[PDB]
Design an enzyme around this catalytic site. Structure first.
Site, mmCIF file in Angstrom:
data_model
loop_
_atom_site.group_PDB
_atom_site.id
_atom_site.type_symbol
_atom_site.label_atom_id
_atom_site.label_comp_id
_atom_site.label_asym_id
_atom_site.label_seq_id
_atom_site.Cartn_x
_atom_site.Cartn_y
_atom_site.Cartn_z
ATOM 1 N N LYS A 7 1.667 -40.772 -37.845
ATOM 2 C CA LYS A 7 2.055 -39.152 -38.633
ATOM 3 C C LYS A 7 3.968 -40.063 -39.031
ATOM 4 C CE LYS A 7 3.626 -34.343 -38.349
ATOM 5 N NZ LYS A 7 3.429 -33.337 -36.943
ATOM 6 N N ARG A 10 3.911 -42.537 -41.469
ATOM 7 C CA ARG A 10 3.611 -41.674 -43.316
ATOM 8 C C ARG A 10 4.923 -40.991 -43.556
ATOM 9 N NH1 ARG A 10 2.009 -36.763 -43.395
ATOM 10 N NH2 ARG A 10 1.280 -35.922 -41.616
ATOM 11 N N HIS A 12 8.401 -41.358 -42.069
ATOM 12 C CA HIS A 12 9.631 -41.289 -42.233
ATOM 13 C C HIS A 12 10.117 -43.075 -42.624
ATOM 14 C CE1 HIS A 12 10.762 -37.600 -40.253
ATOM 15 N NE2 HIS A 12 9.968 -37.686 -39.867
ATOM 16 N N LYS A 41 8.435 -29.461 -47.329
ATOM 17 C CA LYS A 41 8.981 -30.141 -46.481
ATOM 18 C C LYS A 41 10.885 -29.341 -46.450
ATOM 19 C CE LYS A 41 9.284 -33.901 -42.402
ATOM 20 N NZ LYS A 41 10.278 -33.791 -42.092
ATOM 21 N N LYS A 66 18.044 -33.433 -29.987
ATOM 22 C CA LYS A 66 18.092 -31.881 -30.309
ATOM 23 C C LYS A 66 17.116 -31.160 -29.412
ATOM 24 C CE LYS A 66 19.408 -32.540 -34.874
ATOM 25 N NZ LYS A 66 19.824 -33.363 -35.891
ATOM 26 N N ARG A 85 16.413 -33.532 -49.448
ATOM 27 C CA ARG A 85 16.883 -31.804 -49.459
ATOM 28 C C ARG A 85 16.316 -31.430 -50.681
ATOM 29 N NH1 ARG A 85 20.353 -31.074 -45.251
ATOM 30 N NH2 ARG A 85 20.557 -32.934 -44.643
ATOM 31 N N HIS A 119 9.153 -39.365 -33.159
ATOM 32 C CA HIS A 119 9.361 -38.514 -34.179
ATOM 33 C C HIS A 119 10.784 -38.339 -34.299
ATOM 34 C CE1 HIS A 119 11.593 -34.428 -34.272
ATOM 35 N NE2 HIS A 119 12.053 -34.721 -33.420
ATOM 36 N N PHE A 120 10.867 -38.399 -35.496
ATOM 37 C CA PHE A 120 12.626 -38.592 -36.440
ATOM 38 C C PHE A 120 13.928 -38.030 -35.818
ATOM 39 C CE2 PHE A 120 15.222 -41.150 -39.219
ATOM 40 C CZ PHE A 120 16.582 -40.014 -39.075
ATOM 41 N N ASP A 121 14.619 -37.893 -34.861
ATOM 42 C CA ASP A 121 15.052 -36.779 -34.376
ATOM 43 C C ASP A 121 16.792 -36.126 -35.303
ATOM 44 O OD1 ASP A 121 15.251 -34.429 -32.269
ATOM 45 O OD2 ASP A 121 16.902 -35.189 -31.554
#
Lengths: 124, 453
Positions: A7, A10, A12, A41, A66, A85, A119-121
């Site tokens: 994921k 896909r 990031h 998103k 975070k 964004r 995970h992208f933090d």
């Protein structure tokens, strides 16, 4: 079933370009990576580095995620990224994105065997 | 009936097999499919024969000037009854726009035309307008590399048209003089416009004077998007008398990132109390502060305000404003959607919101509190809200520092048959592997529910 590692790829990774080529990059990429399915998103970051270099971050600078977990890692060097964004006129199902190219340090959480980003933090 | 392929690179063998469908289907959409000028020969010829086709879309393909030519030739045919045409993001430049006038003349059935994300430039636009000079209903030209020079030709189109219902020229550098010329054209027009979009067009406070007249003179107008312009309070103040006009029955007003403060918000509140047709408003990305939130909440409690959706993401609201939202939420019976993302509300602020929405008789269906500095500490309240709320159907918690303990709490309520939430939004929230399988389970258990990330 999509695992966290897949994921992450896909959502990031974009190793096939060195940077966003146009202001329409995010509109194209958010659509093709299925990030505009069921909802827009709100924000998303794509990393323009090889998979290998992003995976190496898991053994670089250890930092707190975070959410307070301890298994996050900051890349030593900046990386080529694109920030996508939602604009204020974006409204599902007609999502719309501003594209911003930058060079920043990335922060990822790593987990599993092998120990890979899941995970992208953040970017800093 | 419908051929629709998206984001999919087609082999030659497959392309050959698709050709007969392009030859006869009613709807053909090949978006982001790697099409180039080479295959456009094939397409034009196929379209030449299709007497059923009413919609063509070929967006996000490098057709180029030569490719678009081969496609558009195919449409000039006594059999072609195309109603909708989209060539969005197809690398069409001014050099490829020469055929547009002839093509628009061949297609009296054409109702909607999308040419956004092509660098037509002012010279390309002029050519297109030669075609539009006298039954098109919808025209979209976002990011077409236009300057103010493009606006006199468009103003001429507007003066003449009686059929135009939608105009979108967002994300073009037409600026003050361009918009002024557009407004004069529209002012002298017989068309009944329903949708007008000027997002990120370089509008100034002065343009709000021109727009004031338009809004009052276009009784049919439903949707106005002026987002991302330096309007200022001085601008909005000049716009409001038009919005207060009895002839104005605007349904949707987009004023995000318009450099507004509390003062402009105050002028706008006059409209909100007086105009029952107004259903959707965005004031996102303006520094309104807790004062702004208070004024908005007061208007939302007035009888004439029938607002159903309020977007105020990134407005500089804090926990201190949340009591006002809570009061409004217990009393207002019209507002179904409230977007509060990217305001530093914190756990304390959202907690106040949770108590309000728990109460019986409340109506709010959609709540956005993403990127609101939330922690795992807020998930007790949020989980309780998920069992207590009579109306909540979609909840967005994205981009908060939540982790395993918080999500695990939310999961407790989502498992319960009493919980009828339709969407929980959790973009960019990190939970670990252990939690994910639990999360997967609940998902499989409740088909009415989507957990989005």
């Amino acid at each position: 079933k999509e695992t966290a590692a897949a994921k992450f790829e896909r959502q990031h990774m974009d190793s096939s370009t060195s940077a966003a080529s146009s202001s329409n990059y995010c509109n194209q990429m958010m659509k093709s990576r299925n990030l505009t399915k069921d909802r827009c998103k709100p924000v998303n970051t794509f990393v323009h580095e090889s998979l290998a270099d992003v995976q190496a971050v898991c053994s670089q600078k250890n930092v707190a995620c975070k959410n307070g977990q301890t298994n996050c890692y900051q890349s030593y060097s900046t990386m080529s990224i694109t920030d996508c964004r939602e604009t204020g006129s974006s409204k599902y199902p007609n999502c719309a994105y501003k594209t911003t190219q930058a060079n920043k340090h990335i922060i990822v959480a790593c987990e599993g065997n092998p120990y890979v980003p899941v995970h992208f933090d953040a970017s800093v | 009936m419908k051929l629709d392929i998206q984001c999919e690179q087609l082999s030659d063998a497959r392309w050959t097999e698709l050709l007969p469908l392009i030859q006869q289907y009613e709807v053909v959409r090949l978006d982001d499919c790697g099409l180039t000028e080479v295959r456009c020969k094939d397409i034009g010829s196929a379209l030449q024969a299709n007497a059923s086709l009413t919609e063509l879309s070929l967006r996000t393909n490098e057709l180029g000037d030569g490719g678009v030519l081969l496609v558009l030739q195919g449409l000039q045919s006594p059999t072609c009854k195309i109603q909708k045409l989209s060539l969005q993001n197809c690398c069409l430049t001014e050099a490829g726009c020469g055929v547009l006038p002839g093509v628009l003349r061949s297609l009296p059935t054409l109702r909607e035309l999308h040419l956004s994300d092509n660098p037509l430039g002012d010279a390309g636009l002029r050519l297109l307008c030669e075609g539009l000079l006298d039954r098109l209903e919808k025209l979209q030209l976002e990011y077409c590399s236009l300057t103010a020079a493009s606006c006199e030709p468009l103003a001429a189109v507007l003066r003449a048209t009686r059929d135009l219902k939608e105009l979108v020229v967002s994300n073009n550098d037409i600026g003050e003089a361009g918009v002024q010329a557009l407004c004069r054209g529209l002012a002298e027009s017989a068309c009944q416009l329903e949708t007008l979009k000027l997002e990120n067009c370089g509008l100034t406070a002065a343009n709000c004077k021109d727009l004031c007249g338009i809004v009052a003179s276009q009784a049919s107008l439903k949707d106005l998007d002026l987002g991302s312009n330096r309007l200022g309070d001085a601008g909005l103040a000049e716009l409001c008398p038009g919005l207060l006009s009895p002839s104005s029955q605007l349904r949707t007003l987009w004023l995000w990132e318009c450099d507004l403060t509390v003062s402009g918000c105050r002028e706008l509140c006059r409209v909100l109390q007086a105009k029952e047709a107004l259903k959707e408003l965005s004031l996102a990305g303006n520094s309104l502060g807790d004062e702004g939130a208070q004024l908005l909440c007061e208007s939302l409690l007035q009888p004439g305000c029938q607002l159903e959706s309020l977007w105020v993401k990134s407005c500089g609201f804090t926990a201190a404003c949340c009591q006002h939202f809570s009061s409004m939420l217990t009393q207002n019976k019209h507002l179904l959607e409230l977007q509060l993302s990217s305001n530093p509300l914190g756990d304390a602020g959202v907690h106040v919101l949770c108590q309000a929405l728990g109460q019986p008789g409340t109506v709010l269906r959609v709540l956005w509190v993403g990127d609101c500095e939330l922690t795992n500490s807020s998930c007790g309240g949020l989980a309780s809200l998920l069992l207590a709320s009579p109306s909540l159907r979609e909840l967005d918690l994205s981009n908060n520092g939540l982790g395993d303990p918080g999500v695990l709490q939310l999961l407790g309520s989502l498992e319960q048959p009493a919980c009828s939430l339709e969407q929980l939004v959790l973009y960019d929230i990190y939970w670990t592997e252990a939690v994910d399988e639990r999360l997967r389970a609940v998902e499989e258990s409740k088909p009415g529910l989507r957990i989005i990330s």
